[PDB]
């Protein structure tokens, strides 16, 4: 179960590895947010209790959860 690198980028040398878990992705999204975000962050967690009212982090399991610069504005 393998994330990409993160932030700016397509590539480097990857894996969230020994345990535990999930590619913990912060995404700003001001409200609304209509065409808004352009904010990654991520540096892995052990656990999924990020799920709350004014967050950002949601947990990021399964694969590469990783988007882009969201902005494919489209």
């Amino acid at each position: 179960i393998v994330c990409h690198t993160t932030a700016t980028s397509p590539i480097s040398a990857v894996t969230c590895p020994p345990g535990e878990n999930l590619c913990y992705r912060k995404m700003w999204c001001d409200a609304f947010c209509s065409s808004r975000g352009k904010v990654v962050e991520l540096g892995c967690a052990a656990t999924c209790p990020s799920k709350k009212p004014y967050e950002e982090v949601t947990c990021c399991s399964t694969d590469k959860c990783n988007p882009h610069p969201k902005q494919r504005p489209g």
């Binding site: 700016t8 397509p10 700003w28 988007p67 882009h68 610069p69």
Partner: peptide, 18 residues
């Protein structure tokens, strides 16, 4: 003065491979 800002926080303008 200033130092300072900066953004954000954007994934804008990748990395690049090339």
């Amino acid at each position: 003065y200033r130092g300072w800002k900066h953004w954000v926080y954007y994934t804008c303008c990748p990395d690049t491979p090339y």
